Design a protein around this ligand. Structure first.
Ligand code: MG
Ligand code: MG
Ligand code: MG
Ligand code: MG
Ligand code: MG
Ligand code: MG
Ligand code: MG
Ligand code: MG
Ligand code: MG
Ligand code: MG
Ligand code: MG
Ligand code: MG
Ligand code: MG
Ligand code: MG
Ligand code: MG
Ligand code: MG
Ligand code: MG
Ligand code: MG
Ligand code: MG
Ligand code: MG
Ligand code: MG
Ligand code: MG
Ligand code: MG
Ligand code: MG
Ligand code: MG
Ligand code: MG
Ligand code: MG
Ligand code: MG
Ligand code: MG
Ligand code: MG
Ligand code: MG
Ligand code: MG
Ligand code: MG
Ligand code: MG
Ligand code: MG
Ligand code: MG
Ligand code: MG
Ligand code: MG
Ligand code: MG
Ligand code: MG
Ligand code: MG
Ligand code: MG
Ligand code: MG
Ligand code: MG
Ligand code: MG
Ligand code: MG
Ligand code: MG
Ligand code: MG
Ligand code: MG
Ligand code: MG
Ligand code: MG
Ligand code: MG
Ligand code: MG
Ligand code: MG
Ligand code: MG
Ligand code: MG
Ligand code: MG
Ligand code: MG
Ligand code: MG
Ligand code: MG
Ligand code: MG
Ligand code: MG
Ligand code: MG
Ligand code: MG
Ligand code: MG
Ligand code: MG
Ligand code: MG
Ligand code: MG
Ligand code: MG
Ligand code: MG
Ligand code: MG
Ligand code: MG
Ligand code: MG
Ligand code: MG
Ligand code: MG
Ligand code: MG
Ligand code: MG
Ligand code: MG
Ligand code: MG
Ligand code: MG
Ligand code: MG
Ligand code: MG
Ligand code: MG
Ligand code: MG
Ligand code: MG
Ligand code: MG
Ligand code: MG
Ligand code: MG
Ligand code: MG
Ligand code: MG
Ligand code: MG
Ligand code: MG
Ligand code: MG
Ligand code: MG
Ligand code: MG
Ligand code: MG
Ligand code: MG
Ligand code: MG
Ligand code: MG
Ligand code: MG
Ligand code: MG
Ligand code: MG
Ligand code: MG
Ligand code: MG
Ligand code: MG
Ligand code: MG
Ligand code: MG
Ligand code: MG
Ligand code: MG
Ligand code: MG
Ligand code: MG
Ligand code: MG
Ligand code: MG
Ligand code: MG
Ligand code: MG
Ligand code: MG
Ligand code: MG
Ligand code: MG
Ligand code: MG
Ligand code: MG
Ligand code: MG
Ligand code: MG
Ligand code: MG
Ligand code: MG
Ligand code: MG
Ligand code: MG
Ligand code: MG
Ligand code: MG
Lengths: 49, 272
RNA sequence: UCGAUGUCGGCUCGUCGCAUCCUGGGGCUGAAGAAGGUCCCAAGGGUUGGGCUGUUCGCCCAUUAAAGCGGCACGCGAGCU
RNA sequence: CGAAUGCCGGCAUGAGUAACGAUAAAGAGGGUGAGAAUCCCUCUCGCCGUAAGCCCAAGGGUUCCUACGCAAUGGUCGUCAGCGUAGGGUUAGGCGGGACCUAAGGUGAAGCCGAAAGGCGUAGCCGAAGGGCAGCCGGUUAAUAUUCCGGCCCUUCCCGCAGGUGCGAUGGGGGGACGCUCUAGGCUAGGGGGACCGGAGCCAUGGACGAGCCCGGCCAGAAGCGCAGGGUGGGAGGUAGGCAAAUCCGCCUCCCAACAAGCUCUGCGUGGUGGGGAAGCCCGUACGGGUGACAACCCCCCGAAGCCAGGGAGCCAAGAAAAGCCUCUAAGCACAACCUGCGGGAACCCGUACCGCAAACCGACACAGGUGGGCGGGUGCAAGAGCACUCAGGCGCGCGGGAGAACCCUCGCCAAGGAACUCUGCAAGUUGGCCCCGUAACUUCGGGAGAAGGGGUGCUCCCUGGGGUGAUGAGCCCCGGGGAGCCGCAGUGAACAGGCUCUGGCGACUGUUUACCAAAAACACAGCUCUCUGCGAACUCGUAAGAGGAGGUAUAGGGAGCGACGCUUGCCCGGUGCCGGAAGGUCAAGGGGAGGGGUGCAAGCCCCGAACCGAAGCCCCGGUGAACGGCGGCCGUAACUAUAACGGUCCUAAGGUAGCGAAAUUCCUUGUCGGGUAAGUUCCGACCUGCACGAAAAGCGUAACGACCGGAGCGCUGUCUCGGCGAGGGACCCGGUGAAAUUGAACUGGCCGUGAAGAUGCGGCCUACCCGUGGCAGGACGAAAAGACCCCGUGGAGCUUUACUGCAGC
RNA sequence: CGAGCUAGCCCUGGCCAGGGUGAAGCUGGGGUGAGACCCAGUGGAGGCCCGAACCGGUGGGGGAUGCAAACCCCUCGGAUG
RNA sequence: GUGGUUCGUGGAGCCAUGGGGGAAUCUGGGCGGACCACCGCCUAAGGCUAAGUACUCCGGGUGACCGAUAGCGCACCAGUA
RNA sequence: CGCGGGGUGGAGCAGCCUGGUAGCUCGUCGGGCUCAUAACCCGAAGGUCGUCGGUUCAAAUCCGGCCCCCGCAACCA
RNA sequence: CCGAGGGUAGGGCCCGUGACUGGGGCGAAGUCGUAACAAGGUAGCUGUACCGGAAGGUGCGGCUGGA
RNA sequence: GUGGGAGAGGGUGGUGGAAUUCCCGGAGUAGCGGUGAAAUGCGCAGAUACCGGGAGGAACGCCGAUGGCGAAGGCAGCCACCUGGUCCACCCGUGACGCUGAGGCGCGAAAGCGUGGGGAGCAAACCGGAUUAGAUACCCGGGUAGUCCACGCCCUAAACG
């Protein structure tokens, strides 16, 4: 039947986006750590135009 | 009135509709004086505070005039009488001679063509509005104010009305659609007559949908749910509560009074 | 045997014991004959079809030579329901 | 280190075993090649065809196209590929997104709130498949095109000239601008026919050289006409409202229209010119190219759900916003500006390949699953997007070959019987569409109803009445009737297409639910009733500010129970709860200090501390049950027996009424009597002895409804007696690829014993050559899950309350 | 950190072949003192009916190291709310 | 009313305080563990102040420390597939 | 089988738990009123306290054993 | 073609019958109370409505067959 | 026809005092109520008794009579509006148009029912207190449907002269 992953570019940047994470105190920390851990990608790689 | 139906479908037998004869060939509302976008929504910021709402026909707000000392002395002619989805009372639209249009909740009687007005002057006739003092003790009246200049608030439901009782200082005793004798200030307007369309209390919704149309989702009894989400809940084949009847949140609901005790509004009240 | 031995009945498939329901043989009879009672020997084969109940079981219906009791993890779920 | 169902890694076993992902289906010839069932080609065959064909959108991100390539990826093969290497390929003022607008919602100057981090928030911004907005048809590439090119046709800006007008705003008003269902008139798309017109062709096999067969008979199109329809009255005075101003709008008031008559604006014909162009035949492709062609390019008929669109009629639940656009004025300005022509110049950013019901998206996979929108032709079937066959177009599903056992799956048929089958007709059957006859109890008058039960149903000729388009006619097409006759076993001849009734239980009913075991008698539901709430409402969220309620106001809103409707809902306020009691009795802080203590030589300073005044709660006094609840025991008594209308006595706060009752409640129980059967632990009607019904956790009924549950009869049957054949997919055989769980190690037999009491392994005897392949499941206490019941552990979680203790809230 | 599955709600868009049945309201005639009311024809209602898409998931059967961590065939419910 | 201290209301002072009352300028105020008396110690309600102490992203030294199942998760294009 | 409740004049109930004392309503008997019966009035009688044991000086009363009676439990499998 | 009769199916009417139940009648001397007839010891009777072992009671209104 | 008359005849609306019950203010205690007699019951939380104010509902005293009216039911304070029947005088008009009335049709106390309002007094049911052998009754204290209104049903009566 229908599954749980229904990709959607908008929803994805809108939710796990970078400006998205900067906006909140908890998300900014999410960035810190990922930066502090090394992670090549701080946030998901949404795309297209 | 109240239209009836032959049983050509169970439900549309007991079903009963209003009679919109009193509706002056109007229907399409009046831009300008209303309508405004009406933000429908069953909960506040986030959560749902009143339960069981949502869904139900889209609606446009008819921005009515609920404080008439706006036009003291300026007479206006009642133009139409139309339907208002936001209330039980039908409403009348009227053109002042000032050239301004505005709606008023329509009183029983008031016919299209009639002239109506407000102010200390104003003749005591259906439609006219005046400060409570200047109104004849005993006359009935609707659309009362509670405090000078704050707008109408009492007897505005379909065909409801309040009767003046006496005077007493800068105050005048009323008798609200509920039976409470209240002391209102003299300077509160109150347009004379009863609200009209009193057949409203007689409409037999009819089916399940009918309720759904007016935006009210099904209502489930506490008795149906479990202990986790309401007092009356569990365990075997139904049950008799098992304790003093209570609400989802738990306070008694078969008798417990609510008005907050030490309210300042107490002293101006006298009844039930 | 609880780091798992599936548990009532039905079904399918059977096998065995004999403290034998039939038929084979027999003693005694309050066995004239016929049909019975009762015991003793004997399991080689047979031991039906329905109504009701989940039923085992019983109760009935129409028969029958008879319409036996039990065992096999109340035999049988890596065969079924 | 030998074990921890231990960790990591490697390699065994099952095993050449099960599999190879839809039963839509293949065959042959020819090519290429080191090597083809598997690639190219062609010929034949089978599948889809409201798709398994086209077109958009999301998403994917090189998958597109070309050449060169098989180690791996392909469930086999592979010269092939969506794979490897490399080069190419995506063209826009008009299609989509942006320098347009606004919805929910986000944000957020101001303002407010919060230990902090933060929460709220009118104005403004952001936010789109909504509003606004200028492009049609063809041709080109291996690959892009409304993007490139050709024809034709539009839009804004800027700067000129040439005229017009008080021009001018983020400010006023208009408009934009709206539901559902049913619809008209005319059009278009789309589809059918044609003796007419255009074509390469063709007489096949017994007949036909003929109004014969076959193929096609269009497409865009500015101005201007023409045909549809959409919009809108014009004057003129008066004004105090549209938060400044208005000449605009609004509202009085006189004139002229009341019509679309006139302006507009749409679409739809037609339009200069522009473009297309079939079969078949010739070719060489991986494919398209050339002849046909100077192609013809016309007459009817059906016709939309689409366009004219802001069309109309009805109805009730009463149906976004902002801009563009029109107008009105303010400042400013009036040598500006704006309007109409007419030239000339300027027009950015990003998206465009390809997949896109799918091998390119979502499901670890080339996965029988899931995925929004548009087109979807013909014929016949009453109609259709149904169904059967087939257009165009796409397919044969990336293992094959044989075989023709058991058994499985899927399908067909059957003697006689027909429910005996079984928990149950579970399943399978019968029945089916259409037209016409003909239909009961009951009933809330609609229904029950497709009740039931019946006939008709094809083809030929004859005669005949209606429509539509044309003109009052031909044709063309839609509907009717009659009459004769033909042939089959059979005419909705194939596909799509209710088994029917009688009677209980439950809930009224359409609805909803345990996504992945429960679709119900469960929830919901209109409806009733109790109860709270006078508005800064009650109630709910939040520490607040806030917000919902509600831009509502007692015919309204929150909570609760019952659950359409009919007839009804009896008694107890003793306990509990809620409500009402300016009396008391108790009662904390605090008021009060009689009186006592500690130090100082003292004045002082420091503690206790009794009358007494002190709330809410509680006690106490009343009320209320559609509030929490409850609603008896033992003896006696009638002129047959029997039994008790009558009585006594004990205890209640009062002592279950009506109505129902072996029940969805009946233990004893299969109560007992009637009905249904040959036979009836169920079913149905009675009786009442109700272990242990009973009146809003409603009582007893009820037309209608039901994938609910019980009983029963008809009908029909492979359900059964009791099987039998046949079919196809597997299973079996050969070739290619090749898993799995499990597994202390194995040289792994029966009986009777024996043993931790159920032995291949210990004992005695019995049998028994070594190794396989198809089968059956009795056994290995077979596998799978550190048993899910049980108990234990002073283990854990969810729930309850007059358990303890807190806490919020009041 | 999550409502890209799922549950509600808000904003704005789409979708629902084809048939039955025929409520009110109209118009006409009947009827009366005026009515109620009755006939027709008209009209086209409805949590109506039959059944595609579309949404479900009733019974059976197969699948159970599958095509599939819910699937397939038959069969069935709603299908203008 | 509470926090801090060894201090859990304890004979509970001192030091911080939300609440309410509410002074004094040297003969004025605090403290020395309820309180009072002596005897002493200090000078609150404004602020700044090196060095001695902490740590190790980073650089160099040293190891009865590891040696690619060890040692950081990584010796190797890892916070990567 | 198990839990706890109960046997008292003719009927139905008290009486114990803090042992010495059996009380109430009805009924029954005698007498009255009435023509007579009932009602009402006046008086009177009746209880091995379920039984066998002992506990104490003394048992309805306290304690064990049986005989019936009534109500409650008979769960997980 | 029609057609006696036969057969399938659904209705109408009518008669017999049935556990069991509602009332009615009749049956020399059973039980309980006394509603009515005298003012019947509460005037009665009534349509109706609720209630009660039974006559009955009581509610509202009417009547003279009573005061 | 003309012209007059009486009347609680019908409908609608509006309105006046009397009294009852509740409420508040006053002032006042020690009992009130109730019967054949009493009890329930109400009352030092201040009853009853009196004064004042207020709310609300229903019925309308005297006039009222053995009266009037109406087809029957039935109909009563006062005011107006709309309306029917009806008797008299004048003998003017039509000019036999008349009687009755199966059926239909409307009317129809009280009680009852429906949906909504209202609810003071009374009041079935019901609750207590007396009385009785027992009282499910007559008496006493409470008390709900109902009585009241709007629309709609129901159609009965000793609807009786
Ligand atoms: Mg508007
Ligand atoms: Mg938020
Ligand atoms: Mg509910
Ligand atoms: Mg539940
Ligand atoms: Mg709870
Ligand atoms: Mg084991
Ligand atoms: Mg075990
Ligand atoms: Mg094991
Ligand atoms: Mg013998
Ligand atoms: Mg023997
Ligand atoms: Mg049978
Ligand atoms: Mg045996
Ligand atoms: Mg046994
Ligand atoms: Mg057994
Ligand atoms: Mg067994
Ligand atoms: Mg096994
Ligand atoms: Mg070891
Ligand atoms: Mg391993
Ligand atoms: Mg094998
Ligand atoms: Mg094999
Ligand atoms: Mg195989
Ligand atoms: Mg395959
Ligand atoms: Mg090669
Ligand atoms: Mg085909
Ligand atoms: Mg690639
Ligand atoms: Mg390719
Ligand atoms: Mg190649
Ligand atoms: Mg390969
Ligand atoms: Mg594969
Ligand atoms: Mg490639
Ligand atoms: Mg730009
Ligand atoms: Mg923008
Ligand atoms: Mg914007
Ligand atoms: Mg914010
Ligand atoms: Mg847009
Ligand atoms: Mg555009
Ligand atoms: Mg392409
Ligand atoms: Mg201008
Ligand atoms: Mg403007
Ligand atoms: Mg505007
Ligand atoms: Mg020939
Ligand atoms: Mg054209
Ligand atoms: Mg102005
Ligand atoms: Mg060509
Ligand atoms: Mg319109
Ligand atoms: Mg704006
Ligand atoms: Mg492109
Ligand atoms: Mg493309
Ligand atoms: Mg699609
Ligand atoms: Mg494949
Ligand atoms: Mg797929
Ligand atoms: Mg879909
Ligand atoms: Mg089509
Ligand atoms: Mg058809
Ligand atoms: Mg199809
Ligand atoms: Mg057969
Ligand atoms: Mg046959
Ligand atoms: Mg048969
Ligand atoms: Mg049977
Ligand atoms: Mg059998
Ligand atoms: Mg059955
Ligand atoms: Mg079946
Ligand atoms: Mg049935
Ligand atoms: Mg249901
Ligand atoms: Mg489920
Ligand atoms: Mg579902
Ligand atoms: Mg269902
Ligand atoms: Mg508010
Ligand atoms: Mg909130
Ligand atoms: Mg609001
Ligand atoms: Mg309410
Ligand atoms: Mg319920
Ligand atoms: Mg229920
Ligand atoms: Mg009750
Ligand atoms: Mg009480
Ligand atoms: Mg009580
Ligand atoms: Mg009480
Ligand atoms: Mg209280
Ligand atoms: Mg107190
Ligand atoms: Mg019974
Ligand atoms: Mg029988
Ligand atoms: Mg029987
Ligand atoms: Mg019971
Ligand atoms: Mg019950
Ligand atoms: Mg109840
Ligand atoms: Mg019920
Ligand atoms: Mg249903
Ligand atoms: Mg078979
Ligand atoms: Mg085969
Ligand atoms: Mg092989
Ligand atoms: Mg061996
Ligand atoms: Mg053994
Ligand atoms: Mg050995
Ligand atoms: Mg051995
Ligand atoms: Mg085995
Ligand atoms: Mg096992
Ligand atoms: Mg365990
Ligand atoms: Mg258990
Ligand atoms: Mg413990
Ligand atoms: Mg009609
Ligand atoms: Mg319709
Ligand atoms: Mg429907
Ligand atoms: Mg299911
Ligand atoms: Mg349907
Ligand atoms: Mg402390
Ligand atoms: Mg101090
Ligand atoms: Mg010190
Ligand atoms: Mg000291
Ligand atoms: Mg010091
Ligand atoms: Mg410092
Ligand atoms: Mg390592
Ligand atoms: Mg090594
Ligand atoms: Mg009969
Ligand atoms: Mg009888
Ligand atoms: Mg007697
Ligand atoms: Mg008498
Ligand atoms: Mg009497
Ligand atoms: Mg009476
Ligand atoms: Mg004369
Ligand atoms: Mg004559
Ligand atoms: Mg007459
Ligand atoms: Mg009447
Ligand atoms: Mg009445
Ligand atoms: Mg109602
Ligand atoms: Mg009274
Ligand atoms: Mg007596
Ligand atoms: Mg009384
Ligand atoms: Mg009379």
């Amino acid at each position: 039947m229908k599954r749980t992953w229904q990709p959607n570019r908008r929803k994805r940047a809108k939710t796990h986006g970078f400006r998205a994470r900067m906006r909140t105190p908890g998300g900014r920390k999410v960035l810190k750590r990922r930066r502090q851990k090394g992670r090549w990608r701080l946030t998901p790689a949404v795309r297209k135009r | 009135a109240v239209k009836k139906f032959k049983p050509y479908t169970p439900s549309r037998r007991f079903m009963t509709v209003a009679d919109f004869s009193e509706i002056t060939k109007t229907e399409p509302e009046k831009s300008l004086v209303k309508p405004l976008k009406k933000t429908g929504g069953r909960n506040n910021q986030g959560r749902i505070t009143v339960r069981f709402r949502g869904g139900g026909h889209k609606r446009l707000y008819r921005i009515i005039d609920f404080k008439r000392w706006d036009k003291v002395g300026i007479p206006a002619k009642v133009a139409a009488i139309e339907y208002d989805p936001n209330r039980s009372a039908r409403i009348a639209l009227l053109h002042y001679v000032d050239g301004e249009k505005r709606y008023i909740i329509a009183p029983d009687g008031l016919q299209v063509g009639q002239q109506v007005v407000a102010g200390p002057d104003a003749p005591i006739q259906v439609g006219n509005a005046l400060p409570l003092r200047f109104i004849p003790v005993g006359t009935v009246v609707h659309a009362v104010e509670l405090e000078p200049k704050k707008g109408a608030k009492l007897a505005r439901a379909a065909g409801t009305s309040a009767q003046i009782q006496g005077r007493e200082g800068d105050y005048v005793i009323l008798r609200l659609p509920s039976g409470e004798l209240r002391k209102v200030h003299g300077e509160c307007y109150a347009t004379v007559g009863a609200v009209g369309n009193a057949d409203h209390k007689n409409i037999v919704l009819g089916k399940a949908g009918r309720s759904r149309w007016l935006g009210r989702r099904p209502h489930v009894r506490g008795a149906a749910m479990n202990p986790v989400d309401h007092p009356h809940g569990g365990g075997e084949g139904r049950a008799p509560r098992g304790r003093p009847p209570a609400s989802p949140w738990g306070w008694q609901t078969k008798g417990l009074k609510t008005r907050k005790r030490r309210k300042p509004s107490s002293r101006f009240i006298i009844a039930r």
